[PDB]
């Protein structure tokens, strides 16, 4: 789209400085091995819905 | 079929101990426990994974949609057409190895498990 | 300072017709009109940009936080310690041309203008 | 009363009398308790396909 | 000979304008054209009807095995030993009258006419 | 909905330790392990249960579609419109108490477990 950004550099506040390095504890590690995986052959309706979703976006 | 996406899917199915599927309208679906996840190339040179939820509860401006140090942290959006809630993550293909694809799918499934 | 992040910052500031900043601030800021946009490397080799919306609404996050063709489409989350809405996008820093960095900033600012 | 299906009583073959009483061992004893049950809210595509199927077939 | 099944046989033979059998044979047989149809009580308080078709394969079988608005729509299977095609329907005797028994028979015969 | 159908569904949900939904659009869906089962009033005064299958097996001609002594033994058919393979049983509402409707669901799920 429109590629003309009217910007000036300003000082970074401490709150944004801390937000830009925010961390979250590692979640659900080892879960793929606990649950296991298998190839799925879902509903024809689900296949069509996947196609319609990926084509609309 | 983009060879990058082909190799990425092959590495993922190797990391999951599964036979690698063929190039055949490759929008793949995996059953990870009770979670039906979907893999696709969207956009080009980008591996996208996502799973549909059933809830309509606390899906707007959640802590899930806040960035973390993990780029594979899934985002929870909603399809305006079907109304479905979708938890998704995405990674560029040209920088992927087996560990990162496994990590992407694992974070997707973890967030899907912790959202009921 | 990572040369990838510094090079991307140099290219972005050249694209904005601004002097390239120094290696002091890890997190930089740009005042794009009413939007205070913060640039950072989080995680390593990932250019993250985010702006804090001054409060516009909560129901606009569902469709906004759904993936699209553009990986730079901003995500609308919320800081659980403040409650204020945060728009943010992120790109891997490897081989980012100037146009793509500027496009990420464009997307962030445009979505901050739109929502709600 | 009369008409419609034209028929006549005939002898029953012993193979047919054996087939008419065939039995199978009971299956799935306690299966619902072992697998468990929960209400499901499937895809809207699944629900629409179910509506089409139960309305047309 | 259970009373409900005997009454059902009597009402069917009255609908068919045939003399009601006097010897309590458990499984009865009616010749409707080339269709040798068999009536039985299997299980108790259930009128089962079934006929045998010629051939083994069928490209219009699984669609016949889909439910319809008519519970008397016959199911198409095969003989346990051997591989002869088989058409069969069943109704609960406790909920029938003469007309519905006749309907069960005519549905079995109509399906035997349609297949294959 | 049909009060008889509602009473039967309520008895089933009592048999499953599940809260009965208040007037849900005819077709209900239960998750029995990995099997997505659907209940409906089809036709009127009848309760139809069915689950969709993926690929393994033969729906054209199989032992599954042969009658046994259990009327709740499901049929393996195929929708010619969508191509989906379905496993379905049906019981009249005025013949259903808690035990019988539980037995119907359990037989459906058992035949689903048999075909992988």
Coordinates of C-alpha atoms in Angstrom, one line a residue, chain B residues 42-43 46 48 50 59-63 65-72 75-80 86 88 90 92 94-95, chain C residues 42-43 46 48 50 58-59 61-63 65-71 75-80 85-86 88 90 92 94-95:
Chain B
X42 CA 0.7 -19.7 3.0
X43 CA 2.0 -17.5 1.6
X46 CA 5.9 -19.8 4.4
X48 CA 1.6 -22.2 8.2
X50 CA -3.3 -24.0 12.4
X59 CA -10.7 -15.1 21.9
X60 CA -10.4 -11.3 21.5
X61 CA -7.4 -9.4 22.8
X62 CA -6.1 -12.4 24.8
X63 CA -2.6 -12.9 26.2
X65 CA -2.1 -12.8 20.8
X66 CA 0.7 -11.0 22.6
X67 CA 4.2 -11.5 21.2
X68 CA 6.9 -13.4 23.2
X69 CA 10.5 -14.5 22.5
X70 CA 9.2 -17.5 20.6
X71 CA 8.1 -16.6 17.1
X72 CA 6.2 -19.9 17.0
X75 CA -2.0 -16.4 17.4
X76 CA -5.8 -16.9 18.0
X77 CA -7.9 -15.4 15.2
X78 CA -11.4 -15.9 13.8
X79 CA -12.5 -16.6 10.3
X80 CA -15.2 -13.9 9.4
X86 CA -8.3 -20.6 14.4
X88 CA -2.1 -20.6 13.9
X90 CA 3.9 -19.4 10.6
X92 CA 9.5 -18.8 6.6
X94 CA 14.1 -20.8 3.6
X95 CA 15.4 -20.8 7.2
Chain C
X42 CA 13.2 -10.2 19.8
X43 CA 14.3 -12.8 19.5
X46 CA 13.9 -11.1 14.4
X48 CA 9.8 -6.9 16.0
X50 CA 4.9 -2.8 18.1
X58 CA -11.8 -5.1 22.0
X59 CA -14.1 -6.9 19.4
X61 CA -9.1 -8.5 17.4
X62 CA -10.7 -11.7 16.1
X63 CA -10.5 -11.0 12.4
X65 CA -5.5 -11.7 14.4
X66 CA -6.2 -14.2 11.6
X67 CA -3.4 -14.9 9.1
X68 CA -3.5 -13.5 5.6
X69 CA -1.2 -13.3 2.6
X70 CA 1.1 -10.8 4.3
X71 CA 3.3 -12.1 7.1
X75 CA -1.4 -9.0 15.6
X76 CA -3.5 -7.2 18.2
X77 CA -2.7 -8.5 21.7
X78 CA -3.0 -7.2 25.2
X79 CA -0.5 -6.8 28.0
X80 CA -1.9 -8.8 31.0
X85 CA -3.8 -3.2 23.4
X86 CA -0.6 -3.8 21.6
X88 CA 2.8 -5.9 16.7
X90 CA 7.8 -9.4 13.3
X92 CA 13.2 -12.8 10.4
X94 CA 18.1 -12.6 7.4
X95 CA 18.3 -10.9 3.9

